[PDB]
Curated annotation (Swiss-Prot), chain A:
Many viruses shutoff host mRNA translational machinery by inhibiting cellular PABPC1 activity using different mechanisms. Picornaviruses, caliciviruses or lentiviruses encode proteases that cleave PABPC1 at several defined sites in the proline-rich linker region between RRMs and the C-terminal domain. Rotaviruses, gammherpesviruses and bunyamwera virus relocalize PABPC1 from the cytoplasm to the nucleus thus altering its function. Many of these viruses translate their mRNA in a PABPC1-independent manner and are unaffected by host PABPC1 inhibition. Belongs to the polyadenylate-binding protein type-1 family. Residues 1-83 are annotated as: (Microbial infection) Binding to HRSV M2-1 protein. This is Polyadenylate-binding protein 1. The lineage of its organism: Eukaryota, Metazoa, Chordata, Craniata, Vertebrata. Phosphorylated by MAPKAPK2. Methylated by CARM1. The RNA-binding domains RRM1 and RRM2 and the C-terminus (last 138 amino acids) regions interact with the PABPC1-interacting motif-1 (PAM1) and -2 (PAM2) of PAIP1, respectively. The RNA-binding domains RRM2 and RRM3 and the C-terminus (last 138 amino acids) regions interact with the PABPC1-interacting motif-1 (PAM1) and -2 (PAM2) of PAIP2, respectively.
UniProtKB/Swiss-Prot annotation, chain B:
It comes from the Eukaryota. The chain holds residues 73 to 94 of 636 of the full protein. Coiled coil: none annotated. Component of the eRF1-eRF3-GTP ternary complex, composed of ETF1/ERF1 and ERF3 (GSPT1/ERF3A or GSPT2/ERF3B) and GTP. Component of the transient SURF (SMG1-UPF1-eRF1-eRF3) complex. The ETF1-GSPT1 complex interacts with JMJD4. Interacts with PABPC1. Interacts with SHFL. Belongs to the TRAFAC class translation factor GTPase superfamily. Classic translation factor GTPase family. ERF3 subfamily. The lineage of its organism: Eukaryota, Metazoa, Chordata, Craniata, Vertebrata. This is Eukaryotic peptide chain release factor GTP-binding subunit ERF3A.
Length: 83, 22
């Protein structure tokens, strides 16, 4: 297994790689809930802002919130039957 | 009432690799 992420680590890497980092760790995180499009949702989510995300990591009360919000935004427009 | 209203049209975060349809 690998260790979690921290503001100290996100700083070491550039602002262009940070996004990949957060998303990379978020991939498996959300993969336990919505693996169907974990990456997709992880893209827009992590794209929101590293400032907020940094706090979201230790915020299990807001994380699930954003996740569900996005998942719902899909059905709103259109829902497909893709395995 | 969707205080964030995300963009479902958004694109994945992973790096785009493997050209072509396959």
């Amino acid at each position: 297994g690998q260790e979690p992420l921290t503001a100290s680590m996100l700083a070491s890497a550039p602002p262009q790689e940070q996004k990949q980092m957060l998303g990379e760790r978020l991939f498996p995180l959300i993969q336990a809930m919505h693996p169907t499009l974990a990456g997709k949702i992880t893209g827009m989510l992590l794209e929101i802002d590293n400032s907020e995300l940094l706090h979201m990591l230790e915020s299990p009360e807001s994380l699930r919130s954003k996740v569900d919000e996005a998942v719902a935004v899909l059905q709103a427009h259109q829902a497909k039957e893709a395995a | 009432a969707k205080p964030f209203v995300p963009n479902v049209h958004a694109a994945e975060f992973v790096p785009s690799f493997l050209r072509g349809p396959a």
